[PDB]
A paper describes a structure:
Poxviruses are among the largest double-stranded DNA viruses, with members such as variola virus, monkeypox virus and the vaccination strain [name] (VACV). The core is one of the uniting factors in all the infectious poxvirus forms and fulfills one of the key roles in the virus lifecycle, that is the protected transfer of the viral genome and required accessory proteins to a newly infected cell. Room-temperature and cryo-electron microscopy (cryo-EM) analysis of VACV has revealed the presence of a regular, but discontinuous, palisade layer formed of spike-like assemblies on the outside of a continuous viral inner core wall. Here we show, using a multi-modal cryo-electron microscopy (cryo-EM) approach in combination with AlphaFold molecular modeling, that trimers formed by the cleavage product of VACV protein [name] are the key component of the palisade layer.
Our analysis revealed that hydrophobic interactions dominate within the 2,104-Å2 buried surface area per protomer pair. There are also several conserved inter-chain salt bridges tethering central alpha helices together within the trimer. Remarkably, each pair of protomers assembles a core heterodimeric three-stranded beta-sheet (residues 85–110), formed by two strands from one monomer and one strand from the neighboring monomer. A hydrogen bond network on the outward surface of the beta-sheet further reinforces this interaction, while the opposite side of the beta-sheet packs tightly with underlying hydrophobic side chains. When analyzing our [name] model, we found two highly conserved cysteine residues (C31 and C569) in close proximity to each other, which conceivably could clamp the N-terminal and C-terminal domains of [name] monomer together, stabilizing its conformation. The model of our trimer fits into our STA density map with high agreement, leaving no major area of density within the palisade layer unoccupied. This strongly suggests that the [name] trimer is the main constituent of the palisade layer. However, our fit into the STA map also revealed that the lateral interactions across trimers within the palisade layer are not extensive, given the wide spacing between them. Interestingly, the bottom of the [name] trimer facing the inner core wall is strongly positively charged.
Residue numbers in the entry:
A (entry chain C), B (entry chain B), C (entry chain A): 1 to 599
The structure:
Amino acid sequence: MMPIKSIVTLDQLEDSEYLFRIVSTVLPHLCLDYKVCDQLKTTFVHPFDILLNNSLGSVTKQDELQAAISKLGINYLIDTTSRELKLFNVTLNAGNIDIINTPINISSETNPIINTHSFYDLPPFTQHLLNIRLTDTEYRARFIGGYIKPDGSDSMDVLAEKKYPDLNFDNTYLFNILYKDVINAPIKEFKAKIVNGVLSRQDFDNLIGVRQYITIQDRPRFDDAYNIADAARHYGVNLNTLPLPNVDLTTMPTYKHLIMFEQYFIYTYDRVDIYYNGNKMLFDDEIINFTISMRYQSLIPRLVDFFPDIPVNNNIVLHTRDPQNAAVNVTVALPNVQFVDINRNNKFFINFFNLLAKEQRSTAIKVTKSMFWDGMDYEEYKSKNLQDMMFINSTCYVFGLYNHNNTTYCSILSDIISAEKTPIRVCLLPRVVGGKTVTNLISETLKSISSMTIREFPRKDKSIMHIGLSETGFMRFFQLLRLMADKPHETAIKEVVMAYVGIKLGDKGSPYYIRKESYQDFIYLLFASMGFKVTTRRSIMGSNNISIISIRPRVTKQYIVATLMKTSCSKNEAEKLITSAFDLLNFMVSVSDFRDYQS
Amino acid sequence: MMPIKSIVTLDQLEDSEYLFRIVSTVLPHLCLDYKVCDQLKTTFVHPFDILLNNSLGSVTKQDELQAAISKLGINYLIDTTSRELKLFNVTLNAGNIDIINTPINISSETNPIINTHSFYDLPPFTQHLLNIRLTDTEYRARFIGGYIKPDGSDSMDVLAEKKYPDLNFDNTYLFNILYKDVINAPIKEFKAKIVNGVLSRQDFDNLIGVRQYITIQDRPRFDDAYNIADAARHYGVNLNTLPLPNVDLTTMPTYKHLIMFEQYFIYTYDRVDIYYNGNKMLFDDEIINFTISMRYQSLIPRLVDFFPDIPVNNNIVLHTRDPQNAAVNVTVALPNVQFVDINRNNKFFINFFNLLAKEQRSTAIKVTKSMFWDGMDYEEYKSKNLQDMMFINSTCYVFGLYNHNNTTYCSILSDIISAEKTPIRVCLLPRVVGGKTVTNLISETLKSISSMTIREFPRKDKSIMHIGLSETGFMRFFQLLRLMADKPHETAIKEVVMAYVGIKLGDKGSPYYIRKESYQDFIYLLFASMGFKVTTRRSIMGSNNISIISIRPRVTKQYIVATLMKTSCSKNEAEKLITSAFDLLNFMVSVSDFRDYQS
Amino acid sequence: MMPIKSIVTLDQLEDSEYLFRIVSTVLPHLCLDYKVCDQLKTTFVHPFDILLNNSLGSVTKQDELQAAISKLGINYLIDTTSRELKLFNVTLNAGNIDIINTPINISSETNPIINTHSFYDLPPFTQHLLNIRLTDTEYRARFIGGYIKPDGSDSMDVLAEKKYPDLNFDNTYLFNILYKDVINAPIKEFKAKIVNGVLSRQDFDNLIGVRQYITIQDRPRFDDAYNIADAARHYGVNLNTLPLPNVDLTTMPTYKHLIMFEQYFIYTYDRVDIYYNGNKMLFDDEIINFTISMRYQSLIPRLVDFFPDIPVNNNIVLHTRDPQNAAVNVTVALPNVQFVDINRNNKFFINFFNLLAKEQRSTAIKVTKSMFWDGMDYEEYKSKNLQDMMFINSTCYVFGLYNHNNTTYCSILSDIISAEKTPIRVCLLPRVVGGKTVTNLISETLKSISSMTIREFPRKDKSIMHIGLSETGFMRFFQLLRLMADKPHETAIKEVVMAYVGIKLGDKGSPYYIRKESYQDFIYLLFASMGFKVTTRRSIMGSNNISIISIRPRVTKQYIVATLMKTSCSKNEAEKLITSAFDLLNFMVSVSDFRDYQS
């Protein structure tokens, strides 16, 4: 009468050993002809977690992951320079990320449905995003999640009060920001790389080029913030032989360095005077409007696909100061040249003009339908077989999308329903158990059992020290058993045998051998987990002592095969399960009459 | 063998669909002659949540809500200007509220009982207040909660180390602070309103009048902080034609504007010189003492009801500077005029003198006993029928009040008890489920069933596509069913039928019709939830295919009425429940022999 | 049919009444010959909680507690002055502690295992440390927890990237920092004490002595920060008669005050010029290196036991400025005098040199193996009887220690296992229930039952108003019963009777007497909790009314003794349990035929 059985408690519902119970509660209700969606096999793990803990690359597809990395870096830059909306709750550094403990901000614009669920089993970043998604506007969650529209009409029409533009491009910006060996620069938008302890040559060249646009008053701040003199010496660069600066817009060969100065550096640093035809530029807004319009002329016709209500013209007026400091009205117009007025939203737009330039230079990012962002049409969700629906309602967090106040919100689907509103679309977020997805653990187990070769139960024999598992595998199986309960033997065996298989399908190590001294502990635990009673008795043989482990009912072929047939979708599937478990069954049956002789 | 049944998991205990289970677990144990307390029908939702999310006005009474709004605005002002105690953990803005992620502060003065419960099912604001209430002094919770004493002796004698005065007054201060169309002023105590994008005329007039007491050194700060020149132009006010300032205390027609300057504006702005009889006031404390004593003379006798140990006299000495800058000792005394010394606690008291002036001008706020703040005498709690007690111990969070270290603390009653201390009073906090209170959902269901008209079960017929519910109602009932378990049919039917009624009592829409293609899914779910087995079989009729949904036991009159009589308080109540459910029973019985013919 | 039974809900799993259920779920599975480890009887409560809430001194040993207090104060000082690692998440004040809501910081160095568990039942400080321990490096947790190595080889070899030195010393630093009556000084490392409202004389003398090393430019900052002029007047000290300062290193009688200035005060204050042989010291680093090397010469040979890679030499070069402001190269060497170069890590090392001086002056701190920090060798954990293991897997949080990336991490053991890694050591953290440990409640109950004297059941009699419990004891027992369930009578009685005993073993008060008016409520609850059915009926006797409480099966000797024998490890233990419960059984049996007569 040992305390193997328990009391429902909160810690016992949170430890990851209890998430494996999902795999073991859902898998038994699926038939081998059950199909798992290809788009659900892997899940969403926010990339902020993946790039810090890359062991989780095991739960995402690598193409999808790189796509997400690209897009988040882009969105991060957009939100970082944006002021009208503040959608990210994360500050990125140098091998590390800070989840900001922002005040809980409740407003006039939040989701009317109260979010009660914590998302406790997901990485820190995924818990954070889901708690945002279920509190605020769906638009916000998609943006933060690093969401790329699928190439098609089967998607959500997202509503909001304020929007950021729909840019979709393949880059490695997030990776570069988080690369551990970076400088934690005053600028949050970009982190220059470090090589051999100093500014990398590739980023150094850009910093020294950028330096042509900063003022002698602040150069020391720049140089000390980045340690440019020392990196220059380290890589053989003479920082004092830089070519004369190009600060005049009518001859300036390259505009790109002034643009970067203005987007990133000017936030903490002041700027060098810029001239137009020898005449000092008077307005900051206009050096920006002119510089980006001339550099990105070919992209002006593309602004309207994201910013349809942005003024565009063929006549830009710059204001400058001549040598006598007179104000000068300068009108610039060229055949076929458009100019754009930014409406003083300077950092936000500089970033976009330059992002589109990269869109034009590098390739498009292409993705499949994201089950966790765009999801399914609600009619498709509703039209869905109950077996298929109930799988997703357990293995995935299930969320709707609905309209209210000309805005769309995401929330746990059951809460949209209790709040009496009708969903438009349904999204799924598969869970992660021990570094593997719940859907992949279930899918692989179904695939490997159905693809398996059949035979007979292992026979009873002598000296069986292995349970076909490794020291690691043993311990995984055995500790999971503690979560057992008294219920039909029939249910417990199917769950135990499937767990046994699920472990072998991932455990590729050598068998670990069991010791006579604890042989009986292993027996007690595995048999008890299947509903068999195990007791200990002692017998005297001459002067010898026999420790008898008595199991009732005993485990032999007729017990496992009869019970699996009773609870299987078909008798043939019961045969496929016992063969996949053959390596594990051998111990289960051969120790069923175990006796430990002390001599 | 689909995964309809589940595993206790944490998310399944948090989603709001699981709170409806309280309604469905408690309601079945109450008799129709059970009474629900009028003071429990509605609950406490902290007003900070109600005014941001007004859909929750559905769970409070409107008179109580306005009373709470008035008092919180008052308490907010008191705590905002207070320095001796910091009781609020919330910063209020412009259509939004920030719950401050303050450090968890544990001291020498906290509740000795460890608070283990999170309050996960309540709005952000209510979770926050309850977590404060269970950590710190009860006094603190009452203050933050916006608590007005009931007019009577049946109340708590609250103990603390430090106290704020007992002011009870009807105003709309909290509403005004949170009104979305306000200016996020440098001052946290008050937010001026915005009309047509500029300072409202009503608040503008006060700001321009206030401006007479600010210094030319800081006027630009004031004008820019509020955009007074532009609001003035917008509404036709000439900001530069303001009457000469009244800065001398012996002739100053109105004291009110200097008082506001000093209470609110002076925090971020400096002040203009103030004189007494032509002689510059030397001490800030004295311009305050004199100004408020003369303006609020009629309220001095009322200070002692809140501040019994505050010096009051008939001789005030002011210190001033004459034209030669000599210090002057000025004694002021008038027949029947009292003066009060503030003890340098200037912002705190200015607020009180002016709050009492409003108390004198506008009406008193009157409330009934607050079940969630003052609660019941512990003897009344103990004396309470077990049926009544067990209702509140499920539907409400239940808290005691007890003495320790000459302080009173609130905590979950069971923790006061496990900590071995004796409660003085017991407070109740009814839960919110889907925007409705748990107590109202239970009370309304009992009232409408007991007030209902009786009849017979609906008869079996043809083409029944409705389940007497709406698309929304369907989905609510059907998804709740997933939480079903194997238990006597007798229990499951009573719970299902009552849930059916509880939904119809709120669902006022048209019936939604069911489609032959999913007809069987609806059948599987509703019958399974009542403990009936549902299986699918196919029959061949000539060349046609019949999909047979077979239910065992079948649902017809004798099954539901026999089971409800077995578990009802009386056979007559079983009849009242089936009639209230007639519209829902029709589908349940008529599809009991459902066959889907494919032709 | 009252709502005594319930629904698993989240709040019902969190309230402390549910932790007592652990005591009542584990205790019944232990035999009276079961032994509880002496090192588990008491637990770890982080001292930051104990010193704010000293009611929890009930769950720690006093020697262990003082040891922990000493070490935390030391570690706090080390981490406070350290910059290379930031291990504490707590800021200490004046009778209070702030748990810092730091950003969740995830990096490249965190535990690869996802921590899903919250630790919800522990004090704020213990929850915080366990959440750190399970996220970051084990080294970090040991440091923050205030961990002293046991005197032996049976310990963990902890790995990390960066380390703090292994100092183990007996002091009262944490107590002094948190003493309520302290000044909240600008310096976080030390808080001077307050006596009679002013700086204490003992700390005042040190502050006025420290003042000899601060600059006339900042003296007013110092004096105002501490109110030294007023404390001086209060205790009769003339602050202006202080002896001339000793600012020159070749004659300076005591080095100790310059060292303190430099370690603590210089952080917010500037410093007075220091000279070497009449020649002004030019480098801050060198006044430090020289001052600490000369003062702590005897400790230099001990640095290497903690800092093995720290340069030590017999020739130190100081740089000074002569009267003509020439730079002077001063070489100092003495027979048998070592000098140490600090490598500019000045505040960190000054603290260590002075901590070792205290190590040399005061005694060593000696502790036993800490079960919660160093734990057991994983082989000892594995080798452990299942009864013993399953006890700790319920009553304690169970954690492993494992290697990854040349670092060691701690995590919930089951998560190390599901993550497929092998533990090195296992640590246990016993839970706290109502101010008592779970292991002590279980151990004491086993000890007092096994040490008890046997007899017979109490006999039925008249006027039994007590249940052998106090008003407090009643309420504890009775409310715990609400957590009851339908299960064999046999299990329920053993749990109820043991809970009854566990309460009497702590409840030393007088019996409280039950009132005829609620006599039946107490009966309903205690019998229902043991699986007995209780119903109410009325009988008419002439004109009188009898309220009949009918219990079936009835509770008399044969019911309790037969059921306890069935579920006991031995029939003799069943007898020991009924005698320990005699005082409680009397009511249970004597009211079994209770009738309330209304006359």
